[PDB]
Write a protein that binds this ligand. Structure first.
Ligand code: CYC
Ligand code: CYC
Ligand code: CYC
Ligand code: CYC
Ligand code: CYC
Ligand code: CYC
Ligand code: CYC
Ligand code: CYC
Ligand code: M1V
Ligand code: CL
Lengths: 67, 160, 593, 156, 156, 159, 161, 156
């Protein structure tokens, strides 16, 4: 299935992480196509600066066979 | 994408039906299907044996296997034969599909970067892939071995 | 008044000892404790000599310790109650120091002391820390300070003073995730008392064994157990993509969810709603908060499948807020975060490892039926309602497939029963009566078919009562009582039965109707518990309802049932609930005018 | 297609083609001659299929943008009918409805609502084209084509 | 069974079975008589299959618990062999290895490692049973049976 | 909850310092703790062999491993083995704690409902756990085997 | 993560032999610094809030990076900085106890600089903060153990530079 | 190592290493001298240990690829035995089987199945090395090395 290689840093603005709830924000992550719209919207909702979006798997203009 | 899917994509880009040349391509695939299925049965029959022989004939008894080498430690030998089984299964998939698009989508992308990141030696890896090509060529014959070894050379170039 | 979500047994941890913390760690890693955890336990049990004797000497000299314990306050100006609380607090602090010394952990001190700066009126905090320092000095004064465990007593007193000097620590907040989700607050004392849960974070540069530990914890979160030892966890492409520099823990959680292993475990044996609840457990670490969350999930599954539900759970704002990118989901229970009361019963039955043992979806039933009136149910739950067949005491087992909906009925509450009198007619219900159906023999047989819903074997015949009734020595009521006091009746309806279930089924066989409420059921259960089986049989036969309905010469018959009984007695639906619409016209087929 | 779906089903449990997958592949390759015959027939007679389908669809449903007097709308409807029967030809060639799904029948409702075209009118028209596809094809040919025509019907 | 996975694949995406899946169902439904014949064949000559397989297995490996002089262990080995060819017959009848998987290969290694029996010994005995089924069955039946045999070989 | 937790819980519920009988109970726990730990280590190093021997002597060559039994269908056998490992390791947890609270909170609650829903024989389970008690007794010694068979018997009590 | 013993084993394992006399002598050095490393860890664990207090006082307070428009302005960001400082101290403690800066290179320095450049955290400011925290550990631990913990705080700074 | 695992357990819950963990630290540090003595003892006599383990293992299990007549295979088996006793000494030095697990007992079964040597043969050979280490080491020493021997038994 066609994948997105996405690097983004999503900051927290509504919670203070005490010592363990802190995880990371600068993630590079392979994203499936059918979820990337919702992941882009989610990390835009939380307030993340998306610095790098490329097509990891699949080609451009695929009429079929892309999944 | 497979051979039929690539043909449909090309004729959908050009917007027309499949012409007589693309129908010749499709009849080529459809008459190769039976022997490709027999070779898929054969590769599914002895995959572990093929991996055993190829690690013996290409990767063992060089100092890559011993200490300070990349297949040293039990887990790295397991990871190496895991990668060899990956290449065998995905070359089998590409043989069934008639196109190396599955290798370009799931195998070859990111793999060179990850192998250079982990310190995996690409040269011995490509040697292991073509030794696998030789063993499959030996245990299946010329024609089916040629068809699967073409995709093995595709993997060999993708690592290259 | 409202239906019950269940009150499960909960053990809230007030602190941690040394063995409890080590066993908690080993348990939360799903392994035997290892050599360093072994050294933890054995070294603490080695120091147990010194710890127990420290507690011995401190408890022995406690009176003088708190007698010895800035501007010293006046007794008369402070107040008698406040002086009493000062002395009580001081003795309490010393007690908790000895508790910590024996337990080997200052978790009890730190939990119970850290947020005390303003609980104590905070104008006497200088007096408080001076008194605690003087107790430290005295406790060390009669416990020789050269190189002994007086260093330990100094450290524990120092930890107590350091916890008490910590000012207002911020309460933890489980913020509401939607308009339907209530936000919750959480004291830090309750956070620090709660059992430590490992936070499995997978970074790309971790060693292999740490990565495999994170994989195993991902299996334990999602598949509820370690599947890596089995060959079913052959997911070599997802694992391999996860280990190196790509395919992070969120993508791996999604790949575990959409795998056919997860479908075989928590989607194939379940209906959609129970599957949604289990997915909520396995991908967010918590159960359904509200009904509207379940509406969202159920509609989404209905138009897009369960894999899209997994995609939506792991793609949600709450998932990235708690588990982010590369943290394994963890179960969010009692001390991990603040708990809601809304889903307390279902979520504590869901976090338990026996959550797959329940098939009926616990969250939706509780959430929906709280916003509904009381159900038609036996007062001691639905397991006490037997199956309305001709014979056989068939009750729902509490353990085999628990489909339990607990409900509190009042003492005066009465069940609605569907009577056969208003229904049907007469000469339609007087065919099932069998008074004095004039032959004696038929009346014996019908009294059997009431007492035991089918005709019984010869060894179960009460032939002496047959001879008595054929001779006219006893009437039908006494014969029914003798059949209900026969041994085979006791075996059929009293021995292999829960006692209130036994009382209810004997009431249904001897009265022909279920009980109404806690009046009747309470009286029968009290009778059969303080007096026994034959006493209940005599009290049911001599019950005024038996005399009004069945008199003395009439065999008992079924008169009332539960509405579920008639729903069983109409599998094609009820007769005429609204006029049918045979040969209708719909739009589209009409529009093609 | 059937091959890609079989491979990704083999890919999912990280394994080789199972005893059934090769069997389905052999069935596909041996029915390939029949599938190519279907595709050739459809590509040869698409013009009259579209014309007869539009004839029956306007005799049946006339309250359509297809016959609201604008010739551009009618020509667009004929082109859409030819496109959908070409996608059915792609489906029978590929052995699976995925050329139909990935091109014609996934975003179909949102798109044709955006065009303000009534969805059930397109369903009626696809039923007309399916009936004419029966009218020109043999029994197995028309069964395999009616498969994907009812895929288009379900997507609407 | 294969049709169980067809229905489960139509499920979990909340859709009806595609006519491609219906075609898989038709093909399995017409191969059913051949599969019933193969299962009858296995239930016919299972006794000699276990006898000859144990013979060649002890010929190629005498260092097994099955030939350690304890005849109860040889009875248990014979019965394991018979149970497994019964499961392969079940797999033929169901058209999928999922009966074979869910009865004899899911917790295979945990069971046999608890039984203190080498895994590759069971694998080599399965190779012997595969060769016996090769010897006694016709070529298409031989391929169909030896494929599920190979599935067990992979499980070990 | 270990033995220390239950003891301090009683003392704090009655609101006093640890009483002499309470200190004596802690003394018995603390100076039997070294044999408890040793038993825990060798139970950790030999858990697989114990489970093997217990299935061999209690659960093998009965008709529950045969067809139609509850330990037919190899995945059910692996589940049976894993249940035995869980029982061994949680009895070990209780042995190290000195209290059966980890059993009551993590094993015995949830187990009867699960087994009756799955159709698992309770009697075969209890005879397997008592075989476990005998095997750990034989490979450990009378005192350590009795101290861990107390918790194995608590698990059998909850069944 | 890897500790000093684990790295000694790892070089000797990649070479293919037992620990030679030099590797065992490095082991002697580690095993004889273990007591002071444990004591320093106890001290750092006990006084973590105080160390962050003096550290933020001597490097970060009273300058315009805490002013309006600054990075530690808008209280939640200041508390974020407190959390980062406490995290750095605790991970320096882990590094000091293990004897290796591998845990920092795996869990602290891996992608932290890029993360801060994405959030706009001043890298030089937190580096000055880590050197101030090094000075605080120096003052309240001593020269020897203070220098030892300062080695891994230097590793944090170098991975941040 | 024990140090690493102490640090990891203090991690994953974001806490400082507890006083009990630092007790473990300061005691494993006082365990150091006996660990160096064991590593030196196992390194000093390793050749005789592998010779006598090969002697008893060839006495007890002769159906091995080591005594098939190929001295290359024999030398490779001796190399594996020396490597494993080296890893067990490493685990004494670290205080846990973490070097043992990471280097030799994580992908043990998959590798030796790729090398086709029977797993129980390796188990018998390591049992021979275990009893020679009992022969050459004192009682406490025998315990600390036999622990990781039992770990190698579990993996095979
Ligand atoms: C004084 C009020 C009484 C008292 C209280 C007490 N409660 C708990 C624990 C909990 N209380 C709640 C309550 C709520 N959660 C909700 O969502 C709502 C509505 C907003 C309520 C009221 C919950 C869920 C808990 C569980 C713990 C948690 O914080 O989530 C305790 C502690 C229990 C323990 O022993 O651990 C106490 C002490 N105690 C008294 O004696 C007063 C009568
Ligand atoms: C064996 C012929 C060579 C070799 C192998 C080796 N590989 C790794 C680690 C990885 N291999 C991969 C590759 C893939 N993962 C996939 O999912 C796919 C399928 C399409 C491929 C091709 C990846 C991503 C890794 C890292 C994560 C993982 O553990 O799988 C190692 C281990 C390296 C290490 O230090 O961990 C090794 C040893 N080594 C050789 O010397 C051979 C030439
Ligand atoms: C329609 C024939 C009748 C009807 C239906 C109705 N149902 C609901 C609500 C729900 N229905 C379900 C059902 C299921 N859960 C499952 O897992 C399965 C899949 C096999 C089913 C069928 C559930 C869980 C709900 C709640 C979630 C939801 O609301 O979607 C309602 C709404 C009730 C409410 O209070 O909103 C209705 C109306 N009602 C009738 O009158 C018809 C006879
Ligand atoms: C016989 C073909 C099968 C079989 C039967 C079996 N039944 C029982 C016990 C009961 N059977 C019933 C049935 C009914 N109650 C009704 O009212 C009606 C009509 C609606 C029926 C059919 C009941 C209630 C019982 C329990 C009480 C009683 O025994 O009278 C048993 C005994 C099982 C036990 O443990 O008691 C058996 C064996 N068993 C087979 O193997 C056949 C397939
Ligand atoms: C024969 C090819 C090999 C062999 C066999 C052997 N098996 C046993 C004992 C058992 N085998 C099983 C197997 C199964 N039970 C199931 O439900 C399934 C699914 C169909 C299987 C495969 C079981 C459970 C047992 C235990 C006995 C019982 O039924 O209760 C033994 C005896 C082992 C022992 O220690 O007694 C043996 C010898 N031995 C070989 O050497 C061959 C490689
Ligand atoms: C084996 C000696 C006996 C036996 C066992 C058996 N168990 C299951 C299934 C499960 N067992 C459990 C129990 C637990 N899981 C845990 O994590 C814990 C410890 C905290 C316990 C107590 C669970 C939850 C299951 C469900 C599925 C699973 O495998 O995890 C089975 C399979 C039942 C089935 O039909 O699926 C079996 C066979 N059965 C016997 O007959 C023996 C007496
Ligand atoms: C304080 C010394 C300096 C400072 C701090 C500051 N940090 C943030 C935000 C974050 N800090 C982190 C850090 C970590 N996460 C990890 O997993 C680890 C190990 C790699 C670390 C060290 C993260 C991820 C964030 C973002 C999310 C969160 O806050 O938890 C801020 C906020 C910046 C912003 O909101 O954009 C600040 C202010 N700033 C200074 O000026 C000090 C010198
Ligand atoms: C000896 C106890 C058994 C045995 C062994 C045997 N081994 C080989 C070949 C190799 N052994 C290894 C093993 C390892 N490399 C590692 O990094 C690790 C972790 C320390 C291990 C365990 C390797 C990699 C090889 C390949 C070649 C080499 O020497 O490196 C052989 C020869 C195989 C052949 O026939 O080609 C043998 C015989 N044989 C027995 O019978 C014993 C039970
Ligand atoms: C707007 C959010 C915000 C606030 C409120 C803030 C606090 C702050 N006040 C600060 C300090 C003080 N606040 C106070 C304030 C009080 N002194 C008191 O005893 C009382 C009752 C107050 C009410 C707040 C003092 C004396 C200081 C001296 C600084 C110190 O002791 O370190 C600083 C120091 C840095 C600087 O001034 O540049 C900070 C960071 N800075 C922020 O970003
Ligand atoms: Cl302590």
């Amino acid at each position: 299935m066609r994948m997105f290689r996405v690097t983004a840093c999503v900051p927290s603005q509504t919670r203070i992480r005490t010592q363990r709830e802190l995880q990371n924000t600068y993630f590079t992550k392979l994203v499936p196509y059918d979820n990337w719209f919702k992941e882009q919207q989610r990390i835009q909702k939380m307030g993340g600066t998306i610095v790098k979006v490329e097509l990891a798997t699949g080609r451009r203009g695929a009429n079929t066979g892309l999944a | 994408q497979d051979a039929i899917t690539t043909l449909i994509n090309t004729s959908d880009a050009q917007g027309k039906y499949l012409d007589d040349s693309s129908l010749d391509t499709l009849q080529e695939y459809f008459r190769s299907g039976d022997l490709r299925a027999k070779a898929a049965m054969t590769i599914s029959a002895n995959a572990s044996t093929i991996v055993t022989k190829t690690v013996a004939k290409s990767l063992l008894y060089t100092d890559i296997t011993g200490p300070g080498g990349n297949m040293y430690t039990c887990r790295r030998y397991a990871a190496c034969i895991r990668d060899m089984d990956f290449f065998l299964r995905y070359g089998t998939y590409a043989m069934l599909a008639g196109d190396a698009s599955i290798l370009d989508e799931r195998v070859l992308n990111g793999l060179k970067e990850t192998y250079n990141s982990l310190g995996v030696p690409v040269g011995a890896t490509i040697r292991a892939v073509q030794a696998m090509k030789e063993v499959v060529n030996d245990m299946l014959g010329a024609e089916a071995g040629k068809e699967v070894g073409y995709y093995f050379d595709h993997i060999c170039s993708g690592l290259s | 008044d409202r239906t019950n979500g269940g009150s499960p047994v909960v053990h809230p941890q007030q602190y941690h000892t040394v063995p409890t913390a080590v066993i908690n760690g080993a348990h939360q890693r799903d392994r035997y404790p290892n050599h360093s955890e072994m050294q933890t336990l054995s070294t603490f049990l080695r120091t147990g000599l010194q710890r127990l004797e420290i507690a011995q000497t401190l408890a022995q000299h406690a009176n003088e310790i708190v007698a010895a314990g800035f501007q010293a306050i006046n007794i008369a100006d402070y107040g008698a109650v406040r002086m009493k609380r000062s002395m009580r607090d001081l003795g309490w602090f010393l007690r908790y120091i000895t508790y910590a010394v024996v337990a080997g952990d200052t978790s009890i001190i730190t939990v119970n002391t850290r947020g005390l700066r303003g609980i104590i009126p905070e104008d006497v905090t200088v007096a408080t820390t001076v008194a605690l320092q003087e107790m430290q000095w005295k406790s060390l004064s009669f416990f020789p300070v050269d190189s002994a465990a007086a260093a330990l007593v100094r450290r524990y007193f120092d930890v107590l003073i350091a916890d008490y000097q910590v000012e207002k620590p911020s309460d933890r907040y489980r913020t509401g995730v939607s308009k339907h989700d209530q936000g919750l607050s959480f004291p830090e004392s309750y956070e620090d008392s709660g059992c430590a849960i490992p936070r499995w974070v997978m970074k790309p540069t971790l060693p292999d064994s740490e990565k495999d530990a994170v994989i195993r914890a991902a299996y334990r979160q999602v598949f509820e157990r370690d599947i890596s030892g089995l060959g079913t966890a052959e997911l070599t492409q997802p694992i391999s993509q996860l280990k190196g520099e790509d395919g992070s823990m969120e993508l791996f959680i999604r790949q575990l969810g959409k795998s056919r292993l997860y479908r075989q475990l928590f989607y194939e044996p379940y209906m959609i709603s129970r599957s949604i609840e289990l997915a909520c457990r396995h991908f967010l670490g918590r159960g359904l908060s509200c009904m509207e969350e379940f509406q969202r999930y159920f509609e989404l599954v209905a138009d897009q499948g369960f894999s899209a539900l997994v995609d939506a759970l792991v793609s949600s704002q709450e998932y990235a807020d708690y588990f982010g990118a590369e943290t394994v989901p963890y179960i969010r229970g009692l001390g991990i975060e603040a708990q809601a009361c809304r889903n307390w019963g279902p979520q504590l039955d869901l976090f338990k490892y026996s959550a797959p043992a329940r098939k009926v979806p616990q969250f939706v039933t509780a959430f929906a039926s709280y916003r509904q009136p009381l159900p038609n149910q036996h007062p001691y739950g639905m397991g006490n309602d037997p199956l309305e067949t001709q014979f056989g005491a068939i009750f729902p087992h509490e353990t085999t497939n628990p489909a339990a909906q607990p409900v509190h009925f009042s003492e005066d509450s009465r069940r609605i029963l569907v009577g056969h009198a208003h229904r049907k007619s007469h000469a339609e219900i007087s065919q099932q009566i069998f008074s004095l159906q004039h032959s004696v023999e038929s009346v014996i047989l019908a009294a059997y078919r009431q007492v035991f819903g089918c005709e019984v074997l010869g060894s179960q015949r009460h032939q002496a009562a047959e001879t008595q009734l054929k001779g006219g020595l006893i009437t039908v009521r006494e014969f029914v009582r003798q059949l209900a006091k026969s041994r085979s009746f006791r075996q059929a309806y009293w021995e292999n039965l829960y006692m209130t279930k036994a009382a209810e089924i004997i009431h249904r066989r001897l009265l022909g109707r279920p009980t109404y409420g806690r009046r009747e059921t309470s009286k029968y259960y009290d009778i059969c518990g303080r007096q026994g089986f034959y006493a209940l049989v005599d009290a049911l036969i001599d019950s005024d309802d038996y005399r009004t309905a069945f008199g003395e010469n009439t065999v008992p018959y079924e008169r009332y049932v539960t509405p579920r009984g008639l729903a069983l007695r109409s599998p094609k639906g009820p007769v005429a609930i609204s006029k049918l619409r045979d040969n209708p016209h719909t739009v589209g087929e009409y529009m093609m005018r | 297609s059937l091959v890609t779906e079989l491979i990704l089903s083999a890919d999912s449990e990280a394994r080789y083609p199972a005893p059934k997958e090769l069997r389905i592949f052999q069935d596909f390759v041996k029915t390939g001659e029949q599938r190519v015959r279907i595709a050739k027939a459809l590509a040869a007679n698409e013009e009259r299929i579209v014309q007869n389908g539009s004839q029956k669809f306007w005799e049946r449903c006339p309250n359509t943008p297809s016959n609201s007097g604008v010739d551009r709308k009618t020509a667009s409807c004929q082109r859409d009918q030819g496109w959908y029967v070409r996608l059915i030809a792609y489906s029978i060639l590929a052995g699976s409805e995925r050329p139909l799904e990935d091109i014609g029948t996934v975003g179909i409702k949102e798109m044709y609502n955006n065009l303000e075209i009534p969805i059930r009118n397109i369903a009626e028209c696809m039923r007309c084209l399916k009936e004419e596809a029966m009218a020109v094809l043999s029994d197995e040919d028309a069964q395999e084509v009616a498969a994907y025509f009812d895929l288009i019907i379900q997507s609407l």
